[PDB]
Amino acid sequence: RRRQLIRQLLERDKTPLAILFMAAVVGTLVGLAAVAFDKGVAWLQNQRMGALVHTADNYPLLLTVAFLCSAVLAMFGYFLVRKYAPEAGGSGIPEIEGALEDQRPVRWWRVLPVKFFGGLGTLGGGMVLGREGPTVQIGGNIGRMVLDIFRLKGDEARHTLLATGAAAGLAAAFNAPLAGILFIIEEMRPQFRYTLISIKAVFIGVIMSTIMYRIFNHEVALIDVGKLSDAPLNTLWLYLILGIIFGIFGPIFNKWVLGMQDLLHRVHGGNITKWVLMGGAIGGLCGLLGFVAPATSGGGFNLIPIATAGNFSMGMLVFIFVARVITTLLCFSSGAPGGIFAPMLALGTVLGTAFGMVAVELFPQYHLEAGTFAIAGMGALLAASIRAPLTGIILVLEMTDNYQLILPMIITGLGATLLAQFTGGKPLHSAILARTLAKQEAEQ
Amino acid sequence: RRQLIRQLLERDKTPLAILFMAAVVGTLVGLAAVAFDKGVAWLQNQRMGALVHTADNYPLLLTVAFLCSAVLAMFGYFLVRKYAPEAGGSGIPEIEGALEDQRPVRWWRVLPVKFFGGLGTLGGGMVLGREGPTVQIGGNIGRMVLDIFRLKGDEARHTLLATGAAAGLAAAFNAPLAGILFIIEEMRPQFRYTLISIKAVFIGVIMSTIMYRIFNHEVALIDVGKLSDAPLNTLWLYLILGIIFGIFGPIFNKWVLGMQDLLHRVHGGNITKWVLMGGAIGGLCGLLGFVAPATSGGGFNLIPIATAGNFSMGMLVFIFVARVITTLLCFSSGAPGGIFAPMLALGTVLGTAFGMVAVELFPQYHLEAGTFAIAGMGALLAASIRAPLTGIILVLEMTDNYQLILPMIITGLGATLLAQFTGGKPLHSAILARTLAKQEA
């Protein structure tokens, strides 16, 4: 096949001007979409913090209007999901992964409005879920929508545009143009057969969407940690050890997140009403906690800065950790719309700082700063639970900007994926397609 | 569908044998790459010290400069044409082939030929980079262990050949991320699926950087300081810069190729006019690396200086032309050694220029020419060799001005878009395709 190869090599990196332009459009749209989505969740958490001032005294009355508020939005969310678009529950990433393997339909006329508005619900009420879920799915749909509305033909476009939409969305979720692209080519793209996804394309989209996200959320970052110190070479072994711990814990967290999906199904049968009512029940539980101990609720983007600086005690950390494991399982497994990324960054930080503190007073001659350990572990859960180390590394990197810590971060995140492998854990995004897909065969 | 579920559940499972082997390939390329670096330092030491020897008599020194690079260049070209012909030029295009199983990996040959031979062309101070030597040297090291451990199967042979190449590109710039991104943007078989385990490639790159740092820690190749930021009303400027890089990118490809030709005529393919034409160009460079050093050498030393806005506009245009003229001469002539490094330098220098003009055309944008230099630094790599994603990340890992990510991406993309619409081709593919179609003609 040598003759054929020379023909191919000279035709490499040539993507039809039609796709390139359409990618520009998709990014632009996901961008605005993601921006608008963000504006909304802001607002809804704003009302909730404003209505808690309104009923300022009478403690038990307030503890009631916190719960009842998250509870009322969660419900509105689960309902909008189970009734109009079943396939929008959960994260949303496993569903786009399938769509690239052409094994799940991309019902955009449904999912766009259901996941958008429905997510505002579970996220506004302050549940422990991220943005990626909503946006990566939302994004890919936007990508299908324009493939459909411009009746574009061919395997290339349907894959490429469904991809760039998904990336643009993940970027706009963290202001991470690089991570968005790296994610598509580490976990989105069909992982076993070759696929005609044009990389230049995916880019043009991610860029447009980031430019959009910056037009509106400029002059303030999600995570600000300041320039941490450096990591001496005789310090590295420590980060391996951290990775190992992340590595035995990563599969375990997968067992639960899955086994919890089960245990919670028994509690409502598959019934719209015990679900929605079980929904506002968990949703409310969180909006209440987002007052009596806020570090156990919400996305988690707020406790990163605080925890990294070494402001929590060892006690408050261990608490925060357990409390979050127990609410992330509860919110994601229950099938409310919304990703597991963000909460996973939070758990990683918190666990990292813990390691960091213990490390700091075990070795004074290394002159550590627990904050670096919080930063190496931040993208470690993403590397042992999710099995997408390369995207995590760069995701952390684009949000905390402490490139001097690239070695540590890599080593920790690698120890993670090695130990997650040798203890039989599986990529939590695949294990979820594989379930949702083998359940489409075990009913014939 | 039944088959996919079977696959999904078995995803990201790379046989413990390969993973372990990747570790030793990295470790090996790391030490190798370090060793190589140490040598080139040394040989440039000597030349700088022997110029002190014969300190006065101007024309006598202008002679011992020339004759020195001339002597090492020759020693290089010879060691190449005699024992390992497939080690001349880059070396990246040859490993690309090896992944498509269309070129042999004569490690028992290339390892020592490219290593010692490169020392030669690089020590004499020619305008070529370290990536060529190391990416190739690296992959070979990768075959060597597949061979020496008789490892069986498609997976290993691809996987180890790749991690080796990466680890090598890393250690060349202390760029663990660029290394991996490069394999998955330009190294891996670009049209059929391939069983290259990423987790594997990583373990290797890591081991090798860890190695490179054990010896070259405490000092970075390019230091530019934290430059200012870039206002959103400024971006359109970086698109324009990308466009200029996008029309110039293919043209530089034409020459780089067309000069490969014009220089063959000058020696027929004959080992002696080659080697004598070698030390003639090699010598020309080591001479210039005195009467105007910014036109010679890899180029890593003029980045800092140019970015700070230390050159006048006149000295910039000069430095530019003079460099096009020597990068073409050195790479096209088929001396061992990549083209990356010289291309980063040319992008900087062209960027600064844009920058100055920009700075006094718009005083209300409050610009610093320095940022243009940094958006352009990886723009040649994005319009000449069509690997924007690796370029962006390669600049980024070496200048650390993440706040410029937007500009950088926009210039670099304006580059690959215009390189596309004015018909250029990935300079690394255009070189395989030539060397592969000359294999059947």
């Epitope: - | 206002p231 806005g309 409050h366």
Partner: antibody, heavy 120, light 107 residues
Framework: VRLLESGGGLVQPGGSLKLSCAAS????????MSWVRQAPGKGLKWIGE????????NYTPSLKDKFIISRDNAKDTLYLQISKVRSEDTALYYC??????????????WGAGTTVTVSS | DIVLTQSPAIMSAAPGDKVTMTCSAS?????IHWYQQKSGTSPKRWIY???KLTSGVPVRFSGSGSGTSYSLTINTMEAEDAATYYC?????????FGGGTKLEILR
């Protein structure tokens, strides 16, 4: 975060004087700095700006060495030299730290003022 | 260089009143900024990029315009708004301030 200008008061007409603004509570790199003046009971007139690496220093349309804006990032301090002082320069000088949104620069955090009085 | 000119030079109004001052420009400016100078205080960044509010500027305050016309608008004025307001543009070099509207209160 606070700017504290000083060193005004009396000058002989045709004389000259060094105002030193002095900064604290923010990385005094990272910023362009600027001066502006308010003659008594009147509007605002920009004198000049200057970046962090003292590489670029612009002035208002005015004469050859009328003003000299300089800064020294060791002491966290901006300076201003006025020369051959006519009575138009009788004013309050503000120093102000510079910045931007979409991109058009604005005078961000202003100092407190110093007064200059040109008289015999 | 650009000559910005401000409309009411002095304007009385009683708290409650919706209030609008104006900044007009001889050429084409964009993204103008506004300062509030109270008595014997220094100018304070008030509204920037035509309609963004500096942090902790009461939401009664708003800005807009484009081209040659720009206005800052107090919506239900309040007595503590008694100040002198400068507009300022930096869209063309060198930058330039207005003459300043002086707000005055009627009580």
């Amino acid at each position: 975060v606070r700017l504290l200008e000083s060193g005004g008061g009396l000058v002989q007409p045709g004389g000259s004087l060094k105002l030193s603004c002095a900064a604290s509570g923010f990385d005094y790199s990272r910023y362009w700095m600027s001066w502006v003046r308010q003659a008594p009971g009147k509007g605002l007139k920009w004198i000049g700006e200057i970046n962090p690496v003292s590489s670029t220093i612009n002035y208002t349309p005015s004469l050859k060495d009328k003003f000299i804006i300089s800064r020294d990032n060791a002491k966290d301090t901006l300076y201003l030299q006025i020369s051959k002082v006519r009575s138009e320069d009788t004013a309050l000088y503000y120093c102000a730290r510079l910045y931007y949104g979409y991109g058009y620069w604005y005078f961000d955090v202003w100092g407190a003022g110093t007064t200059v009085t040109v008289s015999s | 260089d650009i000559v910005l000119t401000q409309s009411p030079a002095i304007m009385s109004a009683a708290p409650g009143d919706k209030v609008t001052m104006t900044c007009s420009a001889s050429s084409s400016v964009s993204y103008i900024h506004w300062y509030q100078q109270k008595s014997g205080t220094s100018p304070k960044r008030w509204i920037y990029d035509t309609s963004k509010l500096t942090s902790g500027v009461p939401v009664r305050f708003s800005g807009s315009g484009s081209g040659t016309s720009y206005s800052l608008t107090i919506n239900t004025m309040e007595a503590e708004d008694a100040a002198t307001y400068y507009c300022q543009q930096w869209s063309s070099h060198p930058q330039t301030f207005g003459g300043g509207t002086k707000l005055e209160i009627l009580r």
